[PDB]
């Protein structure tokens, strides 16, 4: 078995920007997920060798974690809050996709999943 290279966190071509917005999804948005009791199988990469998932990466090809999320926003990887908003979707996108309804990890990212929602129905404004 063998995990693929985890996604970037940092890029110097890519270019960047510290919008209020961004600013905002790694203060509160990130960080108030981050303390959920379900949101600890979403902090880093799938380790599909730890957990004996040797499909997962042959069905998943767009990987994405919280704990990636967390580091681009530390480093300044995004231009605009909605590059990040998509990151989170790819994520709980990959679960639905790779689990089925009913399963103990879809409960866990159907929860995170709608109070993401409510934490970003309203951004602060782009001063
Ligand atoms: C979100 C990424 N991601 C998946 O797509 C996925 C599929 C099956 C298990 C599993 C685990 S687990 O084995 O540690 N465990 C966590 C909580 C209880 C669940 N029954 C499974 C952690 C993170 C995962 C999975």
């Given at each position: 078995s063998m995990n693929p290279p985890?996604?970037?966190?940092?890029?110097?071509?890519?270019?960047?920007?510290?919008?209020?917005?961004?600013?905002?999804?790694?203060?509160?948005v990130?960080?108030?997920?981050?303390?959920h009791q379900f949101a600890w199988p979403f902090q880093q990469?799938?380790?599909?060798?730890?957990?004996?998932?040797?499909?997962?990466?042959?069905?998943?090809?767009?990987?994405?974690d919280m704990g990636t999320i967390k580091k681009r926003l530390?480093?300044?990887?995004?231009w605009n809050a909605q590059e990040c908003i998509q990151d989170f979707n790819t994520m709980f996108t990959n679960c639905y996709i790779y689990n089925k309804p009913g399963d103990?990890?879809?409960?866990?990212?159907?929860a995170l999943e709608k109070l993401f929602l409510q934490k970003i129905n309203e951004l602060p404004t782009e001063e």
């Open positions: 985890p996604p970037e966190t940092s890029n110097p071509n890519k270019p960047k920007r510290q919008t209020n917005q961004l600013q905002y999804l790694l203060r509160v990130l960080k108030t997920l981050w303390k990469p799938v380790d599909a060798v730890k957990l004996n998932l040797p499909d997962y990466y042959k069905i998943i090809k767009t990987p994405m530390e480093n300044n990887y995004y103990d990890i879809v409960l866990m990212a159907e």
